Design a binder for this molecule. Sequence first.
Ligand SMILES: OC[C@H]1O[C@H](O[C@H]2[C@H](O)[C@@H](O)[C@@H](O[C@H]3[C@H](O)[C@@H](O)[C@@H](O[C@H]4[C@H](O)[C@@H](O)[C@@H](O)O[C@@H]4CO)O[C@@H]3CO)O[C@@H]2CO)[C@H](O)[C@@H](O)[C@@H]1O
Ligand SMILES: OC[C@H]1O[C@H](O[C@H]2[C@H](O)[C@@H](O)[C@@H](O[C@H]3[C@H](O)[C@@H](O)[C@@H](O)O[C@@H]3CO)O[C@@H]2CO)[C@H](O)[C@@H](O)[C@@H]1O
Ligand SMILES: [Zn+2]
Ligand SMILES: [Zn+2]
Ligand SMILES: [Zn+2]
Length: 217
Amino acid sequence: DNYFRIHVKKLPEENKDAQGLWTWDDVEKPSENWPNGALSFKDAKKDDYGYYLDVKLKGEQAKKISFLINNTAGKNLTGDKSVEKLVPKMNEAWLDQDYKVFSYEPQPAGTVRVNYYRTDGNYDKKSLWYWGDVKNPSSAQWPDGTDFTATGKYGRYIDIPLNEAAREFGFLLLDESKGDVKIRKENYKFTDLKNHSQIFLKDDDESIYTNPYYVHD
Ligand SMILES: OC[C@H]1O[C@H](O[C@H]2[C@H](O)[C@@H](O)[C@@H](O[C@H]3[C@H](O)[C@@H](O)[C@@H](O[C@H]4[C@H](O)[C@@H](O)[C@@H](O)O[C@@H]4CO)O[C@@H]3CO)O[C@@H]2CO)[C@H](O)[C@@H](O)[C@@H]1O
Ligand SMILES: OC[C@H]1O[C@H](O[C@H]2[C@H](O)[C@@H](O)[C@@H](O[C@H]3[C@H](O)[C@@H](O)[C@@H](O)O[C@@H]3CO)O[C@@H]2CO)[C@H](O)[C@@H](O)[C@@H]1O
Ligand SMILES: [Zn+2]
Ligand SMILES: [Zn+2]
Ligand SMILES: [Zn+2]
């Protein structure tokens, strides 16, 4: 009943049994009795990315989850971290190896994952035409188009090999079932290819979202 999932890429220290998750702010029972009142990583579950722990929210209207990883004596290993729910349904965050916090699972360096969600459909035959600061620019024969074939958490996706200190890229969402393929006529253009790793798109929405909740900023 109203948990928030915190994913951890790599624990600061070797033994999971000596480490725990100490939480405060909008959680039901803020940790007490430092350091042992923390939520132990001993019983942490694991997925593709690393460990995860689910924390019961003081909620609603729970909006700020603050946390750190500590050890049995008696260090604050990560420094203090906080996540703010972008929307009420935001229910997971990811901590990477440098203890940065994301609203999505971050992908390996030198890639941008382009996520595409359709309210309908369909999906087949949807593809991405892309260019600019990418290893393999669409080429080609208009209008195809790297197919949206893989399925993830946020609709379908394509992983794009970056190159360099990739800065900025452009793309068009394509519906190959059509006489007019473009979905949106005008070129999309994205900068922040350093500051992200995933982008989120949907339907014929003009906006390039930077979180899976399709809210601006
Ligand atoms: O309004 C109160 C505060 O609320 C929030 O505090 C957070 C801290 O920022 C977190 O760091 C953590 O605090 C831990 C602390 O990390 C840890 O060291 C420990 O402190 C020990 C100390 O090491 C030791 O020398 C001895 O004196 O015992 C201390 C016991 O306090 O325990 C702290 C928590 O008790 O968690 C708290 C929330 O619980 C907020 O971030 C602050 O801005 C705010 O002032
Ligand atoms: O490849 C990078 C390039 O892709 C996009 O341009 C595409 C056009 O949007 C698309 O209409 C199509 O245009 C070509 C016509 O098919 C053809 O008949 C003739 O008119 O030449 C056109 C070439 O521009 O294909 C291109 C891609 O080849 C994107 O909009 C560009 O900004 C981007 O540079
Ligand atoms: Zn759980
Ligand atoms: Zn195709
Ligand atoms: Zn940004």
